[PDB]
Amino acid sequence: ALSLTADQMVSALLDAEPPILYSEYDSEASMMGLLTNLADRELVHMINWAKRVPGFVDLTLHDQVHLLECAWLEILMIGLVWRSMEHPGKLLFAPNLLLDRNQGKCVEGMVEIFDMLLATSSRFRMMNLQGEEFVCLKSIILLNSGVYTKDHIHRVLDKITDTLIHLMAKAGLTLQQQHQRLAQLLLILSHIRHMSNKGMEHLYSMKCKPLSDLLLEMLDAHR
């Protein structure tokens, strides 16, 4: 895991990619029902995706649980944002569930989150985010969101950093451009954390009188 070439790192993360699941789309209670159900099924694949992420299995069971509990919504969000890149003004939750901003108003307090997600997606498109960069960022989120809450984890994070630089270098960018683009991508993760905290607080308010068990434990993990 610590002896992977940047190219080997990329395709490893590329092969580890979870599938794109469909919805049950044909009411605020139904819209939330579609999202809760979809996320609950996505959580199963995220867990198996996390294990295929280099270095993650080297951690203890406790540490694996901690990282996922803190980052699960972040990973879901950056996935949604990446899928929605080619769909301006819309969030591609699923190939059969393309939600508009105005459709977000169906649930009170959801539209503000939709706007943040749309902006993040718009930001990705402006930067022309590459898929190889996306899987790197998503893996960073997994290892960083709960690391300071091991020297091996940061040693893996550095390798992912090397990979991102390797991607930008071969893309023809000057080294000044490499460091700048690297910074721009990682600063987006701060806003993704922000959307997650806001989204989590919104979810906790929906636990106030169609929610699964696994999703509850993921919600309960944030007290």
Partner: peptide
């Protein structure tokens, strides 16, 4: 925890 079990 379901997560801990799903992580085998």
């Amino acid at each position: 925890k379901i997560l801990h079990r799903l992580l085998q």
